[PDB]
Amino acid sequence: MNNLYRDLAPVTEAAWAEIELEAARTFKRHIAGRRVVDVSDPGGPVTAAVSTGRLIDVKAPTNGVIAHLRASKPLVRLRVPFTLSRNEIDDVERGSKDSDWEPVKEAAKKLAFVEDRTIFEGYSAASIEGIRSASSNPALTLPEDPREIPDVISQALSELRLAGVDGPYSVLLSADVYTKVSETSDHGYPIREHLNRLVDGDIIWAPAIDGAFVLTTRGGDFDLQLGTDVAIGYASHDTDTVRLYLQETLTFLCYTAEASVALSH
Amino acid sequence: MNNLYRDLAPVTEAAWAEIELEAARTFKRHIAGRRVVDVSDPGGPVTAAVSTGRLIDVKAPTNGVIAHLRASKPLVRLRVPFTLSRNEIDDVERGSKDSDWEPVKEAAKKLAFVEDRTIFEGYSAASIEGIRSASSNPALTLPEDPREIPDVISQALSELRLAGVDGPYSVLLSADVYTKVSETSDHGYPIREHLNRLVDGDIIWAPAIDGAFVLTTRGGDFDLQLGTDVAIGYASHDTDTVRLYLQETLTFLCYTAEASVALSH
Amino acid sequence: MNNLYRDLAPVTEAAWAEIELEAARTFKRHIAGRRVVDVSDPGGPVTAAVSTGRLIDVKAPTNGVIAHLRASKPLVRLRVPFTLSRNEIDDVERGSKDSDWEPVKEAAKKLAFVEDRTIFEGYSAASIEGIRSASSNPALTLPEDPREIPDVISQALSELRLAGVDGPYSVLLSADVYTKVSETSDHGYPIREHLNRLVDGDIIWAPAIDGAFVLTTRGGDFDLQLGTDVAIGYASHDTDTVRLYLQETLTFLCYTAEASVALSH
């Protein structure tokens, strides 16, 4: 067995298939970051750091010796525990199709939110700079009126053009901004369609982020490094409940500072 | 023979084909519910209940014995009798093509209305909770002005987005609401087209329901269980008329409470 | 895995084989009901109810609609927990052949007693009518003197003959009555042999029932429906003991009211 200790969990095979399906579905729906960044293959469990290729000056060991430390970025392992009713698990073999997988959905939504907020806003404790912090283009303010959203977005499209950047540009919106441009309409279309006319990429719902992000998806600018992708593991169990977790280990690198514009309220 | 006792009816083969065609056509046109919910294969005549996979605590038979009743949902058999003129039946072999099949059409419309109102509004006596009652998302009020319909509908699309739900969303409208958004026009399109721009699913005419319903059609959320699909059976006959019926047996299950928004006036 | 969670139990393979053998043996010995009634194949875990094929009038949904609920019988799941010493379990791999399986035997005897008392005396909370309650033939009183038992039994054989019933008749006795007709002797035979001469079926020891039952085993009159047969499942464990359970889910149907005579003291 492995670190998931999956065979020790009192979960049947059919219940496991339903839990895997629910977690994978809810996660994909709430991920916006993997649609725009380069996603590496999983390095594996032993992978601990990503080389940046830079060098750090250290106090010379002896006379005439020049020493340099190799710089690297550590992976962070992110774990979201959740708790399942054993009655709901037992219902699945009897043929129930409405078993309560709400904790699985909440854990997948929380893991997806962490991953997206780590990619776009950073996680300083894990030495990850967000796309918002690593952007060299000027930051823009989103207006109160949703009918004035496409104007400011177009100004962001000016900045990537002034930065000398090609590629399909894509706009990612926070859930508040996505709702505002979805529910306001002008001439038989919502403002989301007006945003769709400005770019050759995609208007992407990004419920974890704040503000908005416009960026190129030409490739090679944004890199998500995975040691291991999302997995479900077993912690402990009692007569009534099974404690499990969702787990993934990653770091994020931004190679190109001028490939994005961040917007705030 | 079977319970339809079809060979006992004084109905010719050509008349039977015309009656089957008329009933099937009028039924499909008036069904909205089967277009959005999962529809099972017919279980058969012996099928009486659907297992939910839950357990009900009962008074212990003896000391040290723990007993539980299996929970289930009963099927309901729905029968709509109708009456045909025997002269109209006899006209069909002579080559008439305008035989009065209005009672067949009224029976098919009434059966379709019952089935749709059972799926969406429930039938408490049959222990069926409607989609409106089983929805956990907040209920919305439809405005008087049809030009303000797409706004509220978009708010419903916000709620499924706040519920963490994917899939093609579909909007079902009552006949009053469908007529209101069909006959009012803005900038060369009716408001029904404005509703069509908001979703990747379908604006569906639902003449049996009240208000409106917005919901996902990703699958696995709404389940209609059929023991036997719609069939035409023979009751009795006299010199002038044949009494027949339309009959179907079903139950409805909603597994996912947050997959729908109900709207009312 | 399944709902038994059998691989989570700290029970070795040899100990499992001994426990299965002990439980199966003690159960068969104490079952009288399955020898006389029709026993269905196991429906499976999803099976929750048995259709009776009857209809229940419900308040009409709308005008001109006739509604009927399908009638059914719910299954009941019967669970008997028991507790095993872990030292006795560990003794089995070392080659012990006298490991204390008394709790397994007591659980199997209690499960068998419940099943037989449910078949013959009913379980009202599970909507099961016993054979004694569902019998339309008159009830008889068993005499105090065991030498007068065969007389009354013969009167019961008159009643099934007056009911117009064929087939091998079988007599089931309570443990008190079986002991009384076993230990009293007349002319070199116990009274049990005198009972054996009256029928072409079998004198059956039935320690769970009260009184006596005479009935035909021609088939199709008494039906035991099993969702799942007897299984051993794992609940929880500590350093000293393993808590397990015996479990079976069933209902009982009597189709033929005149196929039996019940006797009481």
Author numbering:
A (entry chain W), B (entry chain F), C (entry chain QA): 1 to 265
Could you share sentences copied from the article?
Encapsulins are a class of BMCs characterised by their conserved subunit (Enc), which self-assembles to encapsulate enzymatically active cargoes and can remain porous to cargo substrates. The overall structure of Enc subunits across species with different T numbers is conserved and consists of a peripheral domain (P-domain), an axial domain (A-domain), and an extension loop (E-loop). T = 1 encapsulins of Mycobacterium tuberculosis, the causative agent of tuberculosis, and the closely related Mycobacterium marinum, are known to encapsulate the DyP as a core cargo with iron storage ferritin protein (BfrB)28 and FolB as possible secondary cargoes. In vitro cryo-electron microscopy (EM) single-particle analysis of the Mycobacterium tuberculosis encapsulin was used to obtain three structures of the encapsulin shell in intermediate states, as well as a 2.3 Å structure of the fully assembled shell.
To explore the structural landscape of encapsulin shell formation, we used 2D and 3D (focused) classification and local symmetry to determine the structure of different stable encapsulin intermediates in an incomplete assembly state. All three stable intermediates have an overall icosahedral structure with RMSD values for the 48,52 and 54-mer compared to the structure of the full shell of 1.08 Å, 0.60 Å and 2.66 Å respectively, although the 54-mer is, compared to the full encapsulin, flattened in one direction and elongated perpendicularly to it. The 52-mer consists of 39 fully resolved, and 13 less well resolved monomers, and the 54-mer consists of 27 fully resolved monomers and 27 less well resolved monomers. The 48-mer and the 52-mer differ primarily by the addition of two more Enctb dimers along the edge, around a point of threefold symmetry. The addition of these dimers appears to increase the stability of Enctb subunits that previously were located directly on the edge of the hole. This would be consistent with the experimental structures obtained of 48- and 52-mer encapsulin shells, which differ by the addition of two dimers around a point of 3-fold symmetry as well the multimer Alphafold predictions, which predicts the inclusion of dimers around points of threefold symmetry.
